[PDB]
Design an enzyme around this catalytic site. Structure first.
Site, PDB file in Angstrom:
ATOM      1  N   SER A  15      46.357  50.677  40.227  1.00 53.66           N
ATOM      2  CA  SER A  15      46.860  50.854  38.896  1.00 53.66           C
ATOM      3  C   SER A  15      47.391  49.586  38.274  1.00 53.66           C
ATOM      4  CB  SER A  15      48.016  51.844  39.111  1.00 53.66           C
ATOM      5  OG  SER A  15      48.923  51.211  40.020  1.00 53.66           O
ATOM      6  N   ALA A  17      46.921  45.825  36.186  1.00 55.10           N
ATOM      7  CA  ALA A  17      46.229  45.496  34.937  1.00 55.10           C
ATOM      8  C   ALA A  17      44.714  45.663  34.890  1.00 55.10           C
ATOM      9  CB  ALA A  17      46.700  44.132  34.495  1.00 55.10           C
ATOM     10  N   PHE A  18      44.043  45.063  35.887  1.00 47.37           N
ATOM     11  CA  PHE A  18      42.589  45.136  35.892  1.00 47.37           C
ATOM     12  C   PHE A  18      42.055  46.546  36.142  1.00 47.37           C
ATOM     13  CE2 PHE A  18      38.557  43.187  35.507  1.00 47.37           C
ATOM     14  CZ  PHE A  18      37.817  43.183  36.693  1.00 47.37           C
ATOM     15  N   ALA A 149      42.110  41.104  31.751  1.00 43.29           N
ATOM     16  CA  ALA A 149      42.305  42.558  31.586  1.00 43.29           C
ATOM     17  C   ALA A 149      42.608  43.030  30.189  1.00 43.29           C
ATOM     18  CB  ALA A 149      43.477  42.902  32.457  1.00 43.29           C
ATOM     19  N   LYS A 202      39.014  30.913  43.357  1.00 41.05           N
ATOM     20  CA  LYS A 202      39.459  30.557  41.997  1.00 41.05           C
ATOM     21  C   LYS A 202      40.924  30.527  41.837  1.00 41.05           C
ATOM     22  CE  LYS A 202      39.590  35.174  39.949  1.00 41.05           C
ATOM     23  NZ  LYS A 202      39.456  35.850  38.644  1.00 41.05           N
ATOM     24  N   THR A 259      39.563  31.241  34.677  1.00 42.36           N
ATOM     25  CA  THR A 259      40.834  31.306  35.413  1.00 42.36           C
ATOM     26  C   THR A 259      41.542  29.977  35.465  1.00 42.36           C
ATOM     27  OG1 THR A 259      39.840  33.042  36.866  1.00 42.36           O
ATOM     28  CG2 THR A 259      41.812  31.919  37.686  1.00 42.36           C
ATOM     29  N   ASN A 267      49.338  31.290  38.444  1.00 44.95           N
ATOM     30  CA  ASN A 267      48.774  30.242  39.345  1.00 44.95           C
ATOM     31  C   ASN A 267      49.007  28.896  38.640  1.00 44.95           C
ATOM     32  OD1 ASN A 267      47.426  31.907  41.305  1.00 44.95           O
ATOM     33  ND2 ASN A 267      45.689  32.265  39.876  1.00 44.95           N
ATOM     34  N   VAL A 287      54.422  36.792  43.758  1.00 45.65           N
ATOM     35  CA  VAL A 287      53.668  35.692  44.322  1.00 45.65           C
ATOM     36  C   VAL A 287      52.428  35.369  43.482  1.00 45.65           C
ATOM     37  CG1 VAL A 287      52.077  35.169  46.239  1.00 45.65           C
ATOM     38  CG2 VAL A 287      54.494  35.079  46.504  1.00 45.65           C
TER      39      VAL A 287
END
Ligand code: MYS
Ligand code: MYS
EC number: 1.1.1.8
Lengths: 346, 346
Positions: A15, A17-18, A149, A202, A259, A267, A287
């Protein structure tokens, strides 16, 4: 057959975002769609609100989407199953709650779409490979491509690739996942391994991108990090036995480029901090996907004897306190070389 | 030999942003550098100012850089020659003012670096091919990669590729163009044709990128335009006899991705206008490189029978008043398909 396929039900395990964006997509090709989420109480809040306020805030869910904390009900009757559970909880889920689900999938032969990305720390295996220990490979496909997303969720033009060793399974899933308004366009490929390697690498690369930004570098440098980074994806793919046809497609290049340029991504921000000299702890004090993936990636590369120059320095900067400027220098220590790309045409 | 090479003199024919940025680069590897510019009066203003206020405003030139309106003096004694003259004036220059220069280059065997990008309208030939009608192929190399001029000019980390059929000529130029501080890093390749095709097509593609932005699309869509666009570069390259090894390297992918994301670029802004519905005239009321390149590209593709889906719709939108939304739809009319990428590894 370019003719779409519509279904009665689809379920999405995961569940975030994506997974939620993908439910949105499916809500247009499936009468009903469930999205499995462990906390009932949360399942409530969300369904009340008609919006996933936990991971996809601001998007109002389609009416035909319903969150549920019940695995069985969740998949009951689904004609397509999607996994988006995080890598780290993936095996646990099948162990503790997927016995009936597996039986169903297998009984009914329901196509499974793997959307989880990462490397499991204990086995150094990718998501579809872990799922494949539970479900038969023929039921397995992977979805990967440049697909933020929010945009996928709001119906903004997006292209992805769907991979299966048997191109024919990929083509079928293609007919299901592709929208009637041509806003979500799928391309078939056989390269599952390349897709999974890229999906995971990525993130590691994206941290390098922020590093470069925090070090004073500009867009030329990001473009080179993406170009050189891709060969590392290519090389790890060969080593893992992939055919590599996705490397230069939407799942490899396409997603990597998107990305690495997502400036506000975690990231990126983490890499920028490090690049600006902040130590990880402090940065640490969720993280970033690239931070978590860096170590298992590096162990996997070492085991396969695959050199991954950028990933390696990125791991040293993240893990072993390496000064970024030193890492750049070591990285630049190779001398003059040829690009490293074979001819396409003889 | 990863050992750099330093020289006494270098000249750059072409005084626009990139040529000037490249002078900046050479000013660190060459005692002296001249930059040829036709208007004497302009040559003055610039040298007074110590800055190219015409095309590279804000960058103070290195002291060892001097602009001159005299061809002969310009190349006299140069041990490397760079061409950055616009495509359209390229042949004219050699015709009217390069007789002695050619003789020199050939007499002294001076390596020539082609940095001009585009397609000549009358012959549908690329820059180095036009230069090659005047100078011998062995003296010919091409420089291409993700390299915004300002960043190259200010010494911000940049990687490029240098191409020559004879990899050995490329390797030598590599030792000359690469900086002592590792801020301008060159990679050798043999793919001249791929570099030239990409250098020109990217501009056309960049207009598509703005189109997508002006149509309401987002970053996923740009990432797909870059990925699918690249195959068009790949296909035209094969047709022209290139080996294609640069397609997926810095000169193809790398530069294309940077150019398609340069939001403030003229190709982008023009495409955004069109995408927002503005007609070309009005938009027209300098030329965007992609607008000028679109027509000769299209004639070249037709002559070689190379389909270039995106370039084609971009040409129709720019040239034949095609509504962008219609173009997108026609573009999307192909049906469901496989990605179109071969395996790398069997
Ligand atoms: C040390 C972390 C990454 C920092 C920024 C890297 C910018 C790009 C370098 C590109 C070239 C790598 C050449 C390797 C031989
Ligand atoms: C009509 C001009 C370009 C508009 C924006 C295009 C966005 C990307 C489309 C990607 C896919 C092309 C698939 C071709 C079969």
């Amino acid at each position: 057959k370019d003719e779409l396929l519509y279904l009665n039900k689809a379920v999405v395990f995961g569940s975030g975002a994506f997974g939620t964006a993908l439910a949105m997509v499916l809500s247009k090709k499936c009468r009903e769609v469930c999205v499995w989420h462990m906390n009932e109480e949360e399942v409530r809040l969300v369904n009340e609100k008609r919006e996933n306020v936990l991971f996809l805030k601001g998007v109002q869910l389609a009416s035909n989407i319903t969150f549920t904390s019940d695995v069985e009900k969740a998949y009951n009757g689904a004609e397509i199953i999607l996994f988006v559970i995080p890598t780290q909880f993936l095996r646990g889920f099948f162990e503790k709650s997927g016995g009936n689900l597996i039986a169903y999938a297998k009984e009914k032969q329901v196509p499974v779409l793997v959307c989880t990305k990462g490397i499991e720390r204990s086995t150094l295996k990718f998501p579809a490979e872990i799922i494949g220990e539970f479900l038969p490979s023929p039921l397995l496909s992977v979805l990967a491509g440049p697909s933020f997303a929010i945009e996928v969720a709001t119906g903004v033009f997006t292209c992805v690739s769907i991979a299966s060793a048997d191109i024919n399974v990929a083509r079928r899933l293609q007919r299901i996942m592709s929208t009637g308004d041509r806003s979500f366009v799928c391309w078939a490929t056989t390269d599952t391994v390349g897709c999974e390697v890229a999906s995971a690498v990525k993130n590691v690369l994206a941290i390098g991108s922020g590093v470069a930004n925090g070090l004073g570098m500009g867009l030329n440098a990001r473009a080179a990090l993406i170009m050189r980074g891709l060969l590392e994806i290519r090389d790890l793919t060969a080593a893992l036995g992939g055919d590599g046809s996705a490397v230069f497609g939407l799942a490899g290049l396409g997603d990597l480029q998107l990305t690495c340029s997502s400036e506000l991504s975690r990231n990126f921000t983490v890499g920028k901090k490090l690049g600006k000299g902040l130590p990880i702890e402090e940065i640490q004090r969720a993280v970033a996907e690239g931070v978590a993936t860096a170590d298992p990636l590096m162990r996997l590369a070492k085991q396969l004897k695959v050199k991954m120059p950028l990933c390696h320095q990125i791991y040293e900067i993240v893990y072993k306190k390496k000064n970024p400027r030193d890492a750049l220098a070591d990285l630049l220590s190779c001398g003059l070389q040829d690009e490293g790309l074979p001819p396409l045409f003889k």
